[PDB]
Amino acid sequence: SYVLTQPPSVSVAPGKTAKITCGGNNIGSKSVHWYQQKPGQAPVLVMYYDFDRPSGIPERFSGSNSGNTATLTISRVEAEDEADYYCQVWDSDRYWVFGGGTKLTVLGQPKAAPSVTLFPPSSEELQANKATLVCLISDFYPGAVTVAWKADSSPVKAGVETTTPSKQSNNKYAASSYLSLTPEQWKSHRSYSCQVTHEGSTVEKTVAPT
Amino acid sequence: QVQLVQSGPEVKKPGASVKVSCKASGYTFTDYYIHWVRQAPGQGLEWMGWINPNSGGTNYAQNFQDWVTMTRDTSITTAYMELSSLRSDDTAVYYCARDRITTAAPFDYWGQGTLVTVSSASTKGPSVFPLAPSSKSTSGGTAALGCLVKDYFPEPVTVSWNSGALTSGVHTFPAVLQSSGLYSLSSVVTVPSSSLGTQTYICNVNHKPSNTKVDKKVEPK
Amino acid sequence: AKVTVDTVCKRGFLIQMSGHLECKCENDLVLVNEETCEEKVLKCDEKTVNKPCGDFSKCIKISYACKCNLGYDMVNNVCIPNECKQVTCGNGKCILDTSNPVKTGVCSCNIGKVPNVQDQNKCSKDGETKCSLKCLKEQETCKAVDGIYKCDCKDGFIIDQESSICTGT
């Protein structure tokens, strides 16, 4: 099969020029089409036959294709250009090929430390013979945390389910982590802890049976 | 105006089948291929194949033909994609798209996509538990309280507070998907500590797929 | 600059295929634009800069070289529209289709051939094509010559170079 190779991620500063590459064996001989996809939306054609710009696409978008690399160039990058970008060629053996995709991140957004709220299991849940600890994590940037749980001072071995980070309306990120225990495990330890690590710095909250 | 309007989202058990439609309008139907593209959550675009509205011919991407059937109805200008013997791994958004019948034409128009969710889990209403405010969830005169919306299937649930009368300070979090196939989520609201004795706080949880509404009073412990 | 039945091909003449019209040059001339023909340049030099060295190709200074004009790619020693870089047609050529905001490369076929919709609209299907050229010169009519329609001499008439008009009985 014909292989298109794209860099998984590209980062640029606002106002600078961004270059997304699409590698292929003699891709200069193929008409490369480019699609932009923002979260929750269908892909959108932004460049076709190597360098034809669709109507409505800003002139900052330019395409090129020579030798073994087709390139989508975005000069003076705006924050709205942050999206996934897919190249596409046709192979004469009768099949279409999409590249792996490139995540374009527009830098400039200030780092933000997570806010962490930890709730113990409710009385209603304990009395139903179940226990859940709820660690809520909000307002961080960039959108990547590591969550670790502790029984007293020792790391737990099971029962942890953590979401992926999701972008908030204020463009920061949120996540949450749940620790499932039996009500006996909850009452037998002195406390439990949720440790959220973000950019090398940790925020830990602790709750205890009351 | 060229439009590709797909059918709505689907929730299916393993072993079942689903048939997704793609309604075309605003252009000569028989002059354009209809392609189908698969995107698993967090993943990239994956060309599945095309159907020729003229001859009805098909061109399936490598091995997708084992469980995907592409059909078309020129009478109503709709293409169909039928997935057979579904597996959980088939969960993805499925797009249709058009390009001029020729060599290497670009996919200039796309449908909105259909999310096909395949899970062995069965429909189940949530257990709503209060997350009581305490001195451990209180910081600088503002207390955090919430609701734990546990063990439901499938998405979505809506949470409001005090029937919508409370929105300031509310943060409803996206759901976690547990290894059991059931979702849980939490909604938290920060309020003045001084109100905990006088203002009643109730989260309104709505899980339409089970026709379940729960209004959970959240009291100080 | 679209080519229709009223186009004046300077130093050239109109031809018609299954789905379009275009200008074909006379003698050893090459296309400078879609409807003008000028003498080509064999060896691009410093004196030949910006002069036509082929169909839709001028000599440029790097330094001397014969590069295609903007919007054209050199595929098999011929400057063709970039949208046609990967479109092979068989019994025809690829033309630029602008019927939609997003342009495409589509096949236009020799007289007698039509885009086969079951073969990526390649020229692999037999089909009719009625001539629409306005052959108004004296003793001229539309004929199918070498796969294309063109105004040529009616049967029994030949072009004599003493007047350059179809002559005979």
Report the Cα–Cα distance between both ends of chain C, in Å, rounded: 39
Contact B108 A45 (CB under 8 A): yes
The answer to whether the CB atoms of A49 and C102 lie below 8 A apart is no
Q: For A58-198, where are the E strands, in sequence order?
A: 61-66, 69-74, 84-91, 95-98, 102-106, 115-119, 131-140, 146-151, 154-155, 160-162, 166-167, 173-181, 192-198
| Closest-CA distance of chain A to residue B62, Å | 9
Residues B160, B141 share a domain:
yes
Q: Are A64 and A47 in contact (CB under 8 A)?
A: no
Nearest CB partner across the interface for C86, out of B54, B100, B104: B104
Nearest to A90 among C83, C86, C103 (CB): C86
Which residues between 77 and 116 in chain C have a beta carbon less than 8 angstroms from any beta carbon of chain B? 86-88, 97, 100-102, 104-107
Both tokens of residue C138?
Answer: 């004296």
Do B109 and B201 share a structural domain? no
**Whether residues B116 and B129 fall in one domain:** no
Please state the separation of Cα C165 from the chain's center in Å.
23
Q: Determine whether the interchain pair C82/A52 forms a contact, defined as Cβ–Cβ distance below 8 Å.
A: yes
B142 and B102 share a domain? no
Q: In this structure, are residues A47 and A56 in contact, taking their beta carbons and an 8 Å threshold?
A: no
The C-alpha of B77 sits at a distance from chain C's nearest C-alpha, in angstroms, of 17
On chain B, the residues whose CB falls within 8 A of the CB of A172 are: none
Query: CA C11 to CA C149: how far, in whole Å?
Result: 18
Q: Quick one: three-class SS letters along chain B?
A: CCEEEECCCEEECCCCCEEEEEEEECCCHHHEEEEEEEECCCCCCEEEEEECCCCCCEEECCCHHHCEEEEEECCCCEEEEEECCCCHHHCEEEEEEEEECCCCCCCCEECCCEEEEECCCCCECCEEEEECCCCCCEECCEEEEEEEEEEEECCCCEEEEHHHCECCCEEECCCEECCCCCEEEEEEEEEEHHHCCCCCEEEEEEEHHHCEEEEEEECCC
Q: Is B103 on the interface with C (CB under 8 A)?
A: yes
- For tokens 């091995």, the residue is B63
CB–CB of A117 and B188 under 8 A? yes
Let me know whether B100 and B126 are in one domain: no
Q: What's the CA gap between A60 and A80, in Å, rounded?
A: 13
Q: Name the residue of chain C whose CA is nearest to B55's CA.
A: C118
For residue A184, the surrounding DSSP H or E stretch is: helix A183-188
Touching chains, A (3+ CB pairs < 8 A) = B, C
- Say if CB A116 and CB A143 are below 8 A apart: no
CA–CA separation, B190 and B83 (whole Å): 46
Please name which of B22, B38, B107 lies closest in space to residue B72, comparing C-alpha atoms.
B22
Chain A residues 71-100 with CB within 8 Å of chain C: 90, 92
Instruction: Give CATH superfamily name and number for A109-210.
Output: Immunoglobulins (2.60.40.10)
Determine the Cα angle at A158 with ends A198 and B130, to 5°: 75
Is C98 within 8 Å of chain A by CB? no
> Residue B146's domain is classified under what CATH number?
2.60.40.10
Q: Are A44 and B110 in contact (CB under 8 A)?
A: yes
Q: Which of B59, B36, B63 is nearest to B47 (CA)?
A: B36
CB neighbourhood size of C138 (10 A): 11
The candidate with the shortest Cα–Cα distance to A47, out of A60, A34, A56, is A34
**Cα A67 to the center of its chain, rounded Å:** 32
* CB–CB contact A29 C83 (8 Å): no
Cα dist from C87 to A75, B104, C106, whole Å: 31, 7, 7
According to DSSP, the β-strands at B78-83 and B92-100 are: unpaired
The region that residue A26 occupies, defined by phi over 0 for left and psi between -120 and 50 for alpha, beta otherwise, is left
Question: Which residue from B95, B130, B148 is facing A42, i.e. has the nearest CB?
Answer: B95
Verify that B126 and B55 share a domain, yes or no: no
Cα gap B90→B14, rounded to integer Å: 9
Residues B114 and B173 occupy one common structural domain: no
Structure tokens at A88: 């596409």
Tokens of A127: 């009395």
Rg value, chain A, Cα: 24
Report DSSP state, residue C161: T
Domain spans in chain A, listed from the N-terminal domain onward: 1-108, 109-210
Rg of the Cα atoms in chain B: 23
Pick the CATH number of C9-169 from 3.30.420.40, 2.40.50.180, 3.40.50.300, 2.90.20.10: 2.90.20.10
Query: Strand pairing partners for B96?
Result: B36
Contact A141, A111 (CB under 8 A): yes
| Domain extent at residue B84 | 1-120
Q: Give all chains having 3 or more CB-to-CB distances under 8 Å with chain B.
A: A, C
Per-residue buried b or exposed e for C69-81, using 16+ beta carbons within 10 Å of the residue's own CB: beebbebeeebbb
Same domain, B111 and B5: yes
Q: Does A178 touch chain C (CB under 8 A)?
A: no
Q: Point out the residue among C102, C106, C118 whose CB comes nearest to the CB of B102.
A: C106
Same domain, B26 and B126: no
Q: Is residue B30 within 8 angstroms of chain C, CB to CB?
A: yes
Which token pair is B174?
A: 């996206």
CB pairs under 8 A between A and B: 119
The answer on B17 and B35 residing in a single domain is: yes
- Please check whether residue B63 is in contact with residue B38, taking contact to mean a CB–CB distance below 8 angstroms: no
Question: What's the rounded Cα separation, in Å, for the pair A107 and A11?
Answer: 7
Give the one of B113, B132, B174 whose C-beta lies nearest to A122's C-beta. Answer: B132
Q: Enumerate residues 6+ apart whose C-beta is below 8 A from B174.
A: A163, A166, A174, A176, B185
Q: Cβ of B102 and C88 within 8 Å?
A: no
* SS3 annotation, A121-150: CCHHHHCCCCEEEEEEEEEEECCCCEEEEE
Q: Which of B148, B171, B177 lies closest to A134 in CB terms?
A: B148
The structural domain count of chain B equals 2
- Chain B residue numbers with beta carbons less than 8 Å from the beta carbon of A9 are none
B56 interfacial to chain C (CB closer than 8 Å): no
The architecture CATH gives domain A1-108: Sandwich (2.60)
